[PDB]
């Protein structure tokens, strides 16, 4: 049939390294931690060469028996995929830890990818129903987030680059950072070293976000778009005008929302657990400027951000009260 | 700005091993040999990642230094690229020894695909002037070609196999043919072992090869498509439809002769010695099956092949005329 795939795709990273443009998500909820092995094996299966994980999903030891299967039965090579994982706010000065607990639940040498997963640092309380003997999102009893006071989000940042930069240290291929603004960017870039070969962030037809784009555009970072059918119940699905271009294009609505971000240069990471969903859609809709222009006009004039808990509320963009659902 | 670019698709082969979509072709005239190292060098500074060459085309040492130059500098790694290169039927029963000539001429410790060239058989000509000591196309006082009598062309691609099977031997990551028809792809399937990740062919609208398709893909090989502009003065532009496909995806119509094989899932290698027309000839256009449609009734209503020399007039699918000029 017709080509690329999305499975096709590979954009080029700043530090020279290939990324494909198409990622399997596995922010899965907790109920279903498990069904992630299968959702993996599916995606490679398929033709995904990209996985996304992070040390707060608690999915890295499913991703990783879902690898060492496809490694064990011949499926896959090592060389052939590219592991994305993140450093959660509460190890936010302790990097190596956190790498080090990635890589032993993943079963694996080294990751493709290390994020800061966001300009974050929070306190510290022991949990041994936690992760890794700690609470995720520490609240007091107030209900109020526990940020560590004194805390430099930046310092994550530092310690990924020393990591990084390492001639000793094979751990990792490529350092980025997740939910940064264009401030915190611009600090980064005035005061650290490596620039972030990625800045994850939530996109789609309902946030652009084209200021963001046209920065990392202008400073050599390529955005990663997460939650782009909408998160829970794929609500991104249900514009008419996404209806609308998968139709032109004979492909499924999940295909169209891929290839928005395709299209524009941005890396996607899709998540499902539907192992024939995540298998059949992987076409490609190669939109017309001007129909992502109308996609993008969609956004501005109703903009609703999916990802918006209570704990990121100090962030400037981010309001802790979730979607606007009128929006909607 | 859109995306894909043609330098970041990537297509997989039987054994698994991906290929970029896009090649280099470099099978420039003896008058110009030399320039091939700065189109090489051009090509992959502008993002290809495949080159493709051949023992025959006396651009191997110029390819060797434009890539020595980039691995130098540290524009590129070798493990980055994807080259291509082939055993001439004067080599027929000689695969070690051309394989050996190619790494040498190239400066490389391997190469990704190593190909038959024809399913040709030569006699050995001695000439100190020629390639390695030989005539290149050896033709009597008649003016007839020199075939080996008694020489089975599929000697060849068993000396090929024989390499790629020596788990001892790392010189080649994938084996294939070209210029093979239907009917000897059968007779090697038949009797052979391992099936060819590639046959590469003359395509493109004037000569659209729907059955020769339709058989790799039911069998597990990709097309490549050689002359893809038509060889010589690239005609091929010249055809309307191309220069009205070319202005409504807002593309050159070199994007739309690389896109009609992109699209359709085969693998391109147009020639240039140009470094801007190699450099800003990286689009994509997505054509509709119904344009596919109409670009394979123009080639199916008006065929030429370009590439039909004297020395292939032997196998049935050729003449050894050339180009029927009055399909132009
Ligand atoms: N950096 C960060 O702070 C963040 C990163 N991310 C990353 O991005 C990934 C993607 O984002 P995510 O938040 O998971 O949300 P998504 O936008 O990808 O939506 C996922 C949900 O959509 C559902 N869905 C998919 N297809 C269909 C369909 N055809 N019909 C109906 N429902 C459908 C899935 O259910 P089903 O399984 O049944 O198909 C799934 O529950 C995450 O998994 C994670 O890796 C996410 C949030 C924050
Ligand atoms: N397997 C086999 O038996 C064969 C394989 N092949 C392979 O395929 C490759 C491509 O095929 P090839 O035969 O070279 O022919 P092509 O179809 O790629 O056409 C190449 C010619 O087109 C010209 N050209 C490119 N762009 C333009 C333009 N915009 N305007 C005008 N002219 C243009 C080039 O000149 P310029 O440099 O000035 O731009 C060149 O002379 C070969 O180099 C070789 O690697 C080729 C023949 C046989």
Chains 1, 2 share one sequence.
Not at 186 to 200: A, D, G, M
Not at 244 to 252: G, P
Not at 267 to 295: C, H, Y
Request: charged share 25%; aromatic share 8%; glycine share 6%.
């Amino acid at each position: 049939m017709l080509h690329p795939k999305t499975t096709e795709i590979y954009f080029s990273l700043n530090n020279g390294v290939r990324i494909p443009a198409l990622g399997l998500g596995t922010a899965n909820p907790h109920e279903k931690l498990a069904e992630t092995k299968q959702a993996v094996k599916a995606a490679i299966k398929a033709g995904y060469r990209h996985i996304d994980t992070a040390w707060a999903y608690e999915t890295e030891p499913f991703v990783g028996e879902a690898i060492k299967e496809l490694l064990e039965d011949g499926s896959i090579k090592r060389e052939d995929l590219f592991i994305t994982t993140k450093v959660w706010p509460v190890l936010w000065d302790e990097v190596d830890r956190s790498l080090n607990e990635s890589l032993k639940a993943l079963g694996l040498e080294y990751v493709d990818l290390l994020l800061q997963h966001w300009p974050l640092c929070f306190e510290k309380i022991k949990d041994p129903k936690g992760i890794s003997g700690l609470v995720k999102t520490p609240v007091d009893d107030s209900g109020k987030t526990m940020y560590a006071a004194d805390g430099d989000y930046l310092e994550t940042y530092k310690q990924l680059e020393k990591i990084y930069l390492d001639p000793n240290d094979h751990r990792v291929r490529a350092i980025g950072v997740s939910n940064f603004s264009i401030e915190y960017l611009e600090r980064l870039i005035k005061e650290c070293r490596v620039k972030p070969t990625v800045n994850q962030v939530e996109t789609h037809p309902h946030l652009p976000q084209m200021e963001l784009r046209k920065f990392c555009f202008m400073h050599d970072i390529l955005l990663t778009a997460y939650s782009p059918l909408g998160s829970h119940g794929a609500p991104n699905l249900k514009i008419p005008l996404v209806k609308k271009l998968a139709e032109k294009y004979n492909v499924t609505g999940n295909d169209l929302l891929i290839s928005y971000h395709i299209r524009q240069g941005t890396i996607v990471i899709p998540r499902s657990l539907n192992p024939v969903r995540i298998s059949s859609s992987i076409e490609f809709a190669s939109l017309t400027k001007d129909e992502l222009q109308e996609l993008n006009d969609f956004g501005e004039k109703y903009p609703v951000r999916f990802i918006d808990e209570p704990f990121a509320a100090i962030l400037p963009e981010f309001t802790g009260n979730g979607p606007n659902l009128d929006n909607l």
